[PDB]
Amino acid sequence: SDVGTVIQVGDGIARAHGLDNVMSGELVEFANGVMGMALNLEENNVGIVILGPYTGIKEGDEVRRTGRIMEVPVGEALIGRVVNPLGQPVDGLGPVETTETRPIESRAPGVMDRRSVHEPLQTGIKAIDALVPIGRGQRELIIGDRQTGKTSVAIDTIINQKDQNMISIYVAIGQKESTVRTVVETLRKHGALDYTIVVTASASQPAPLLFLAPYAGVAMGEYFMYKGKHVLVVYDDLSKQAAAYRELSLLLRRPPGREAYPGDIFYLHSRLLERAAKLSDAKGGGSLTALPFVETQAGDISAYIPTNVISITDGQIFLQSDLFFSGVRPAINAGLSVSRVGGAAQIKAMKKVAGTLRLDLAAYRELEAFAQFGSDLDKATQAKLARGARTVEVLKQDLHQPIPVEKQVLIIYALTRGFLDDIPVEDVRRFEKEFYLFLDQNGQHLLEHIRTTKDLPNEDDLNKAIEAFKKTFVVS
Amino acid sequence: MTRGRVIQVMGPVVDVKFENGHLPAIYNALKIQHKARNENEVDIDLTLEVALHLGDDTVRTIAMASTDGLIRGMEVIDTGAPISVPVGEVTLGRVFNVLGEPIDLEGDIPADARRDPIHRPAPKFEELATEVEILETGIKVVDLLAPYIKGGKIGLFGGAGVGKTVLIQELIHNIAQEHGGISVFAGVGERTREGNDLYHEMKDSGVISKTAMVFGQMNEPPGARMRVALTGLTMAEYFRDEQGQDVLLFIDNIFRFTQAGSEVSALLGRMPSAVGYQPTLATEMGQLQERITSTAKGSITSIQAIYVPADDYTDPAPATTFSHLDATTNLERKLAEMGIYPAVDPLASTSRALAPEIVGEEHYQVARKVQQTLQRYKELQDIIAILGMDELSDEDKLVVHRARRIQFFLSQNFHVAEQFTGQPGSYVPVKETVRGFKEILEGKYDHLPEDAFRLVGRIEEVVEKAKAMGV
Amino acid sequence: TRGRVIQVMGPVVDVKFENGHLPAIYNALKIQHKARNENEVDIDLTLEVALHLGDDTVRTIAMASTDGLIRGMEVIDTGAPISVPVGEVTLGRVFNVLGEPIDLEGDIPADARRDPIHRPAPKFEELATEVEILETGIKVVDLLAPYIKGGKIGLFGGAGVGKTVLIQELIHNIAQEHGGISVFAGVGERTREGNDLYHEMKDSGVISKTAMVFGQMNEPPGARMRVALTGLTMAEYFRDEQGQDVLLFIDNIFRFTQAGSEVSALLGRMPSAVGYQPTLATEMGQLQERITSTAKGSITSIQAIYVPADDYTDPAPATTFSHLDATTNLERKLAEMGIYPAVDPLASTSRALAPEIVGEEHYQVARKVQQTLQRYKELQDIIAILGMDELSDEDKLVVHRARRIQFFLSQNFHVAEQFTGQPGSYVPVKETVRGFKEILEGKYDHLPEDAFRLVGRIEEVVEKAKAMGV
Ligand SMILES: Nc1ncnc2c1ncn2[C@@H]1O[C@H](COP(=O)(O)OP(=O)(O)OP(=O)(O)O)[C@@H](O)[C@H]1O
Ligand SMILES: Nc1ncnc2c1ncn2[C@@H]1O[C@H](COP(=O)(O)OP(=O)(O)OP(=O)(O)O)[C@@H](O)[C@H]1O
Ligand SMILES: Nc1ncnc2c1ncn2[C@@H]1O[C@H](COP(=O)(O)OP(=O)(O)OP(=O)(O)O)[C@@H](O)[C@H]1O
Numbered sequence A: 001s002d003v004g005t006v007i008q009v010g011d012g013i014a015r016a017h018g019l020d021n022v023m024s025g026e027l028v029e030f031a032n033g034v035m036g037m038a039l040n041l042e043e044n045n046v047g048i049v050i051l052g053p054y055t056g057i058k059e060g061d062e063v064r065r066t067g068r069i070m071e072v073p074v075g076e077a078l079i080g081r082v083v084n085p086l087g088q089p090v091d092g093l094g095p096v097e098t099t100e101t102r103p104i105e106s107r108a109p110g111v112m113d114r115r116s117v118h119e120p121l122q123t124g125i126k127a128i129d130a131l132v133p134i135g136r137g138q139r140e141l142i143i144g145d146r147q148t149g150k151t152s153v154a155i156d157t158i159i160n161q162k163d164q165n166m167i168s169i170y171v172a173i174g175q176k177e178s179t180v181r182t183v184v185e186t187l188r189k190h191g192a193l194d195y196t197i198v199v200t201a202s203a204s205q206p207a208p209l210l211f212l213a214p215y216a217g218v219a220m221g222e223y224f225m226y227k228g229k230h231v232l233v234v235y236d237d238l239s240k241q242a243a244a245y246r247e248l249s250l251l252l253r254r255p256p257g258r259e260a261y262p263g264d265i266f267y268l269h270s271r272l273l274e275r276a277a278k279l280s281d282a283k284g285g286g287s288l289t290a291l292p293f294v295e296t297q298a299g300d301i302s303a304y305i306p307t308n309v310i311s312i313t314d315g316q317i318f319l320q321s322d323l324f325f326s327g328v329r330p331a332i333n334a335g336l337s338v339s340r341v342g343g344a345a346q347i348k349a350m351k352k353v354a355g356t357l358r359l360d361l362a363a364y365r366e367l368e369a370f371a372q373f374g375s376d377l378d379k380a381t382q383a384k385l386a387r388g389a390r391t392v393e394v395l396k397q398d399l400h401q402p403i404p405v406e407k408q409v410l411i412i413y414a415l416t417r418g419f420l421d422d423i424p425v426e427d428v429r430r431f432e433k434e435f436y437l438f439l440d441q442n443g444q445h446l447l448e449h450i451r452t453t454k455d456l457p458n459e460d461d462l463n464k465a466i467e468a469f470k471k472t473f474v475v476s
Numbered sequence B: 001m002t003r004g005r006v007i008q009v010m011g012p013v014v015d016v017k018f019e020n021g022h023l024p025a026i027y028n029a030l031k032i033q034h035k036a037r038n039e040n041e042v043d044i045d046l047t048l049e050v051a052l053h054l055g056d057d058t059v060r061t062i063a064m065a066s067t068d069g070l071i072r073g074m075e076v077i078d079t080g081a082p083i084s085v086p087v088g089e090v091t092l093g094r095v096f097n098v099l100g101e102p103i104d105l106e107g108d109i110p111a112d113a114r115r116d117p118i119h120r121p122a123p124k125f126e127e128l129a130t131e132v133e134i135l136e137t138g139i140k141v142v143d144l145l146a147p148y149i150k151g152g153k154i155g156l157f158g159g160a161g162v163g164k165t166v167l168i169q170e171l172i173h174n175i176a177q178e179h180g181g182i183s184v185f186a187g188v189g190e191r192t193r194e195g196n197d198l199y200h201e202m203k204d205s206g207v208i209s210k211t212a213m214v215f216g217q218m219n220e221p222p223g224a225r226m227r228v229a230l231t232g233l234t235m236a237e238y239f240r241d242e243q244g245q246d247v248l249l250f251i252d253n254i255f256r257f258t259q260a261g262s263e264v265s266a267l268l269g270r271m272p273s274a275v276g277y278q279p280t281l282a283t284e285m286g287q288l289q290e291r292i293t294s295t296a297k298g299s300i301t302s303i304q305a306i307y308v309p310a311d312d313y314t315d316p317a318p319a320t321t322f323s324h325l326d327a328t329t330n331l332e333r334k335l336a337e338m339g340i341y342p343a344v345d346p347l348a349s350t351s352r353a354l355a356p357e358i359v360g361e362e363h364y365q366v367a368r369k370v371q372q373t374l375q376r377y378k379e380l381q382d383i384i385a386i387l388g389m390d391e392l393s394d395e396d397k398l399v400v401h402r403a404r405r406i407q408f409f410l411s412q413n414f415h416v417a418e419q420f421t422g423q424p425g426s427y428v429p430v431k432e433t434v435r436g437f438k439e440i441l442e443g444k445y446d447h448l449p450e451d452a453f454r455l456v457g458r459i460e461e462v463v464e465k466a467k468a469m470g471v
Numbered sequence C: 001t002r003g004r005v006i007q008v009m010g011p012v013v014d015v016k017f018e019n020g021h022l023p024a025i026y027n028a029l030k031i032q033h034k035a036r037n038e039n040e041v042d043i044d045l046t047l048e049v050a051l052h053l054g055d056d057t058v059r060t061i062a063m064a065s066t067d068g069l070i071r072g073m074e075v076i077d078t079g080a081p082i083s084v085p086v087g088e089v090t091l092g093r094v095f096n097v098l099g100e101p102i103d104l105e106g107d108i109p110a111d112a113r114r115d116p117i118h119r120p121a122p123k124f125e126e127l128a129t130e131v132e133i134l135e136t137g138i139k140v141v142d143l144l145a146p147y148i149k150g151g152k153i154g155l156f157g158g159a160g161v162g163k164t165v166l167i168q169e170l171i172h173n174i175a176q177e178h179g180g181i182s183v184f185a186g187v188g189e190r191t192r193e194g195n196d197l198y199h200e201m202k203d204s205g206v207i208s209k210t211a212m213v214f215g216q217m218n219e220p221p222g223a224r225m226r227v228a229l230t231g232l233t234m235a236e237y238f239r240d241e242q243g244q245d246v247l248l249f250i251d252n253i254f255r256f257t258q259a260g261s262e263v264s265a266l267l268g269r270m271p272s273a274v275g276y277q278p279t280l281a282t283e284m285g286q287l288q289e290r291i292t293s294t295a296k297g298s299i300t301s302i303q304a305i306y307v308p309a310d311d312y313t314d315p316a317p318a319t320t321f322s323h324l325d326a327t328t329n330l331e332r333k334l335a336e337m338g339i340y341p342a343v344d345p346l347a348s349t350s351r352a353l354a355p356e357i358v359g360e361e362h363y364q365v366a367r368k369v370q371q372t373l374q375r376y377k378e379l380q381d382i383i384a385i386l387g388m389d390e391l392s393d394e395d396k397l398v399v400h401r402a403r404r405i406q407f408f409l410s411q412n413f414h415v416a417e418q419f420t421g422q423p424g425s426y427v428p429v430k431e432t433v434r435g436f437k438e439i440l441e442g443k444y445d446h447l448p449e450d451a452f453r454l455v456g457r458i459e460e461v462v463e464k465a466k467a468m469g470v
């Protein structure tokens, strides 16, 4: 029949005898009210992973099958609410009021069902928008050592995307709920909770629910992507999902691989992350973009999980510790940071302004190393080092101060065309803000042309305005 | 029959058989008491915790007391609940073990006192509350570059022989004996010599009247060493919830918790993982540390010591616990080999509080700049070795000149270091620290010799020291 | 004849054929079920036999996800391996692992010729060899490790080094020149790059000269295993029965072996090496041997290989290294430095760097370049310890010219217009040799080192130096 008796219980796994007609992936329910997923079927005993606190489960307990595959409730009511990976409210405030349930075992958008990523996305950060542009539908990785700026950049991005309608989802995997509370409160404070959903997986909750969390997040997002919305999903630590699956595999007695992870690590993350796409015009035009994160010990790019996830994503933003403590924030290493959809995601004015900046910054870095070993350099090398030093200042930015795309191109054009020649490196940051104010109060028409056209204006008036501002600006 | 027989014994682990229909739960406590009928047989005083239900009426358990002398056919008793440690106000000024029994040789807690379980789920999302407020302990480095957070976790990371316990004791002194508030102390995996020295130091300081203690020690079987911290936590929980009183919870060398879990899992039959660690490293850790939080009803501040197994900081246990903390001080060894105590890494140490609007604009403005100058010193050493005077020039030379002065000033004389030199310690307040570092950065005192800046408390003392030495 | 499913553990299933007949290894089985009630899920599945068990039982690797499978399901035996539609019909179309087409443009009827994917390799008598250079227009490959027509080409690298940029550049130039049938099989790729490449091909019109088989990351391991064999099977017909010269492209071959390792533990194989299956080299050689040029036809095969942790000494890259005739190894340091592509000049090799193939002057120039680069490679460790003012005149000149050289190995690319916004260039071999001869002799010492970065021809170097104002 549809029921069976549990025969073993421990650490979240429970073999059962019976359950003759059970299907693979089917949800089952215990008398404790705790749900379970029937992952493996042997000849005479099912292997059940427990989706709740296992303390209440005993041998000889009956288990019943629901008759359906693993399903996550979805809808518009979830916006602004906090929920488990399962459809259970965590903030109280009554039920989640969801519309319908999407099976989370669905296939990805197939070949030729997509389109080239061309829709821009603005983080509000000069360095990221200028050097590593992101487009909608793209999957880009932000990676680095702990305490460097992962969640600061994710939250800055979510907050800056306030106008352009974008159903956003923020998945917390294996988190400390004080940080979940602080993130929720920052979203509410800056007025961004009204268009976000938060799914919570925390260490007190059993290990299987950490593995299900990003799957549930993407399954929630893909409802809005199928109906035609632009969507965003954030995974602030995929590394903790890897560990959860490593736990789940070993408890089922399965051999390891490199490091200690099993071989299915690539399959799991690829199965997850392939569901992000920019659907074709025949499908509706939705654009789900994912922003996963992984933490690398000692800031090491060359490891099993880091390179595993790097091979599945369309770009790298590398956060480096000694740059962070040197005062360069946000700390991004030009060399190891690049995007594989670059060029399309930038508006044409930005491309005309700066398209060689990243390569020239990596050249500045390697030349700084060569100067570190040597004593002194020739005149043109001095000039190159001088300009490369200035490029770093123009990309410094303070926390929680977003900038629109139009303002960036002014300062980047000033930098690339050599207008920061007479300004010492100490005064560059002051120059930036004074230039912002001067263009806001004197040179509005150029910014108007940029805003309406989406292209660079006639440079004569721009050059005259910059010269006039250089007349206004006082040097220390 | 409610009672159950013992089928197998293997080290700490014991396998009990219960009649069908009367099996215990996962975290039940079981008791064994034996009447010896033969000269060969021995007296038994044993209680055990369930771990797994391994099917066919059999249950696998973990030893809390040593299993030597066990026999097959003995009768186990099911308490139907966990250890149920007695708790209340009765436990103030007493020393216990993991089972809830005192070891201070004073008396027996009455049989009608209320007792509560050790295992229970953590505070929910709605019940937590968040604020950042400084706790001032007077240690220059930790109060300038990484101030503590009331209601938050603090971690002391270091190897063997660095000073973690010296820091613990110094914090107990400076904070508890000059701020007040209920304290609980759990010695975990420590030399039992220090379980006596702390007792006597607190009594001769006169502070035991408002603290409780639990000790498990290395000697005990692996299960007790891990359950001890949870007993300390279940003690503090009653203070914070039912009495509504804030708690300061001290735990020493928390690594022994993971190490004992690893050993117990190896006994249990779980497959290995990582560097011999159990599969459930972060699940079993997170279940513990998620309960140490500040709800709206009351708060727990915890100061903990994390021992790094070797030179490798990237060991799974130090790495996984780093995700749970709020402020951390990492203890250097090369500074300790230079005698610059306390050997705290001024660049690896972190705190959630160091922000221009959480700890003060001026404090942050000086702190981040000093950290920048330290990072500048770190990278710039090579040019000095390779070429010396005519490459260490101009601004780098001046940076080195002031950085050498400011490097030693992070050192301070300690109260618990009176054994090592003949002079007492000093508690240095925040304002003085912030002003003193600034006065160094001005060059106001850079003509003083660099060695003077060691093991003093206020910037005027450095002029006094330079006059006393005549250098 | 039918068999009952009795076990299922992820990718692997365990059918029992109790009728008195059993399938052979590599055969294909079918599951087609109609849901009897609202709880059951309708399923259409195929399984390939991988191992024979004891009692009327076989271990079968599933080709698609196994959800909904119930013990006691009935399995049909097709009696033959996986069949692939073979002919001129494959040109233009895109297919999946089982042989069905992926684009919506149509269907393939029953009358089409279909061939099994598993068969023995060519014998020793059939092979043939030649030395003819295949010009690429890429300075590094052309001057330091020339490719050869009909020779296996290997691109080795870890994640994010420049492998697929090189694949696209080579496919653009070669498909511009060669009148060859082309087969493109993507194993374990990003499913977005497949669509992007399809649209680029449609812009180029090469789609009529190309046949494509696609299986990517989102697929269970069995399809990832068999996709490269399907693409090879098509290239086989084109090479032999038509007698037409063919090109076979495969990007990141590794996932063929990775998928085999993942299901290996489920198949009862004891572990080996770094988690790999015991049968690694047998399977890798079995695949690689079938890709050969015979007298009947020739296959120019260009392959890209991925390293699990970027350690070239990893078992899988090490086994593959023996099957190549030219290899370019790309490693992250050059990518960090800004020089592109990331090919290592002193570890990329080909069977064609010999005066009897490339001529005396070319060989001398290449070897002298490599000598200068090795001298600087040791001088970096010397200079770190002693400083840069303790070296003598000649030791300083070595550093100067090595710096001038490794920049000139960087080239403005065609497909890198999106990434850097530059036109692109095609550099003839003679011009590369002339420029490098000018460099080694010190004819361009006065130019600053920045002038040599990301340019096609030495004339563009002089133009960029003129732009710098020198
Ligand atoms: N523009 C900026 N200017 C200055 N500081 C910044 C800026 N952006 C981010 N930061 C700093 O970066 C840090 C971000 O910490 P956060 O908690 O977001 O990190 P995380 O990597 O997500 O988490 P964890 O370290 O807990 O794993 C903070 O110290 C914040 O002050
Ligand atoms: N403030 C100090 N001033 C001078 N020397 C000190 C100071 N603190 C510690 N030391 C020296 O370093 C040693 C530190 O010993 P301690 O037991 O505190 O280190 P530990 O290995 O971190 O501790 P444990 O392993 O017991 O947790 C002392 O024995 C003493 O020699
Ligand atoms: N010639 C070049 N000029 C400039 N940038 C380049 C060049 N070649 C590659 N890049 C940059 O490096 C990135 C490398 O991406 P690519 O698809 O080539 O990776 P890969 O080596 O195939 O890696 P993976 O195995 O992870 O797919 C490109 O997206 C681009 O940003």
Ligand SMILES: [Mg+2]
Residues within 6 Å of the ligand: A150, A151, A236
């Ligand atoms: Mg974080």
Ligand SMILES: [Mg+2]
Residues within 6 Å of the ligand: B164, B165, B166, B190, B194
């Ligand atoms: Mg100690």
Ligand SMILES: [Mg+2]
Residues within 6 Å of the ligand: C164, C189, C190, C251, C252
């Ligand atoms: Mg690829």
